[PDB]
Write a protein that binds this DNA or RNA. Sequence first.
DNA 1: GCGACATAAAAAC
DNA 2: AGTTTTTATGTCGC
Length: 290
Amino acid sequence: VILTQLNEDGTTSNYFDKRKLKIAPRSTLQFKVGPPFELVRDYCPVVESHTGRTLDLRIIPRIDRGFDHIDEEWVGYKRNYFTLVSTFETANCDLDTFLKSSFDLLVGRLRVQYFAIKIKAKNDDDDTEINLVQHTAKRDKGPQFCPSVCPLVPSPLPKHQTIREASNVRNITKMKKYDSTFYLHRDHVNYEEYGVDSLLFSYPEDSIQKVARYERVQFASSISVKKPSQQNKHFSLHVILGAVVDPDGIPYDELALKNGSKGMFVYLQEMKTPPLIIRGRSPSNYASSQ
DNA sequence: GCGACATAAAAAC
DNA sequence: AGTTTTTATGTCGC
């Protein structure tokens, strides 16, 4: 009925089928590690502007809520939240050095303003994009929004337990405890240590995330979860690492820039999950029907 | 099948 | 120790 796997940090993931077992909304059993991500591809190379050294990049993503491993399928529920977190790392550059340096895209060199992550959902069989929506903790009593592009600096990915613990913090003392895990406050560095052209100082805001945390995420309410044949559709969640550049023949998305103009989010690397099944609102997807 | 509102149970404080 | 918050899901109306 409940199948248990030990996570990397010694917490457990407890996989259960909501058709058969109903668990309380805030039970820790609702937190669990989802499917592992795989490389789709690498895109534009990035080099350090004097040394010419290629920057090694790696996305480090994880799902922490919303998906169960049931009979060799990964299963989510249309009505319920998932959590997708990600960092990236630069194997050949320590953070402190990285932030003082400057980097170009090797297309012929566009200057990188900052690095950022976005997420997408797709139909895994035909590559059609599927809309994602997020809520605040207030859900229907607050606004709905689409996942945003998240500027980030390189960081290790927090353990599953840390993401759990930080999911619904309001208390100022507890917020302070987690601040250094999730944020870099540029306004607190010694500005004299940095050149005008340094990467740190081309990030758009002073508060810079170390971790992209997409919580309270759902597939859009309009998604059809079954094919006409009544077979389940297969979905996939994608994480894309990009370099944001000034636009003034490679994969990119347009982005609302900080100075008002049209920025370009140039793709660097993309990872995706294996195929995902999503259970819809049918009564037969719930233990209450039995 | 979906937008909307109701219930309810453990976390958070 | 009690109150408020958060989120899975139950249900109503079209």
